[PDB]
């Protein structure tokens, strides 16, 4: 149904969860629901909020944070509250760090993939992220469940969006590429280029991507690197990355099983994978030969 409106009276603001580029998000308890928050600051998101009103009502999806509608006073939407956290941080946060296993790195990016497939699917618009990233992706159910919100991003952009070229969805399907390569070997990508962000757009745009993963499994591999293609029309579409995503699932048991186990984890042409996919080719092993 469309969003509702909101008193604000009835929203206890506990601690603040982000302060980031977004604005600030919150802790808030809502007809008793745990939410979150987020103060829209400008006149500018203000504005794109109320020109996508109907195509914001009929999101509704499992991996995509629920939009429970906004207050008017002050003016703030008013969000599922993932407990988890964002992606990034799971992956590249603050010791002490949880362990997971590939199981969790395909889960999660076959979540991601199921969520955008769902908005590139939307009618008549196709709803297109343009900025799909680890940061926007929040968990779940003990980190099992993934759920896009937001329906330095330069090294998961594709390079004919800052290129100024007009773009399709398939700007998403690189950025979702770069996300499996990244849960895949809990590496930032490009953070060997780093300096200022042109500095990865002048690379990325120049054909350079993350480096191969040693003894990936060559499906993954040959979906990761058809996802990075320079030309976007080489790229698969969601709907196809799901199938194939959703298939491998049978070779990667234990997804559901909550993150709890503790890490310490540090980094060494081409690099390991974080993740081990030594259950994964006796799986296969048994279907095949
Ligand atoms: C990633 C960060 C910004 O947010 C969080 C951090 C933590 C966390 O790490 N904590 C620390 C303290 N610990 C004790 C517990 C774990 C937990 C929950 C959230 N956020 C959320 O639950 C949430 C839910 S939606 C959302 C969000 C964030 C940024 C932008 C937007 C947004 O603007 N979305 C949008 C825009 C237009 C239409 C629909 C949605 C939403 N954030």
């Known amino acids: 149904g ?3 409106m909101i008193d604000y009276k009835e929203i206890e603001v506990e601690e603040v969860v ?3 580029a977004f604005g600030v998000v919150c802790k808030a308890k809502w007809r008793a629901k745990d939410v979150a928050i987020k103060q829209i600051e400008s006149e500018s998101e203000r504005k794109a909020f109320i020109v996508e009103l109907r195509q914001l009502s009929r999101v509704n999806h499992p991996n995509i944070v629920k939009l429970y509608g906004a207050c008017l006073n002050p003016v703030c939407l008013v969000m599922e509250y993932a407990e988890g956290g964002s992606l990034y941080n799971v992956l590249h946060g603050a010791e002490p760090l949880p362990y997971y296993t590939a199981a969790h790195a395909m889960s999660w990016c076959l979540q991601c993939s199921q969520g955008v497939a769902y908005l ?3 009618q008549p618009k196709a709803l297109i992220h343009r900025d799909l990233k680890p940061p926007n992706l929040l968990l779940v159910a003990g980190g099992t469940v993934l759920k896009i919100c937001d329906f330095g991003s330069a090294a998961w952009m594709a390079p004919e969006v800052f290129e100024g070229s007009n773009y399709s ?3 998403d399907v690189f950025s979702w590429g770069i996300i499996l390569w990244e849960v895949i070997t809990r590496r930032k990508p490009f953070d060997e280029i780093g300096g200022p962000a042109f500095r990865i757009m002048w690379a990325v745009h120049n054909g350079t991507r993350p480096p191969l993963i040693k003894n990936l499994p060559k499906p993954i591999e040959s979906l990761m690197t058809r996802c990075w293609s320079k030309d976007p029309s080489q790229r698969p579409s969601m709907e196809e990355i799901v199938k194939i995503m959703t298939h491998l699932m049978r070779y990667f048991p234990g997804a ?4 709890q186990y503790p890490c310490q984890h540090s ?3 081409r690099v390991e994978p974080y993740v081990d996919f030594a259950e994964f080719y006796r799986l296969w092993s048994v279907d095949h030969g």
């Open 120 to 122: 590139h699917s939307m």
């Open 267 to 269: 980094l060494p042409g």
């Open 169 to 171: 969805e398939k700007c």
């Open 2 to 4: 469309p969003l509702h």
């Open 256 to 259: 559901d099983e909550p993150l």
């Open 18 to 20: 982000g302060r980031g």
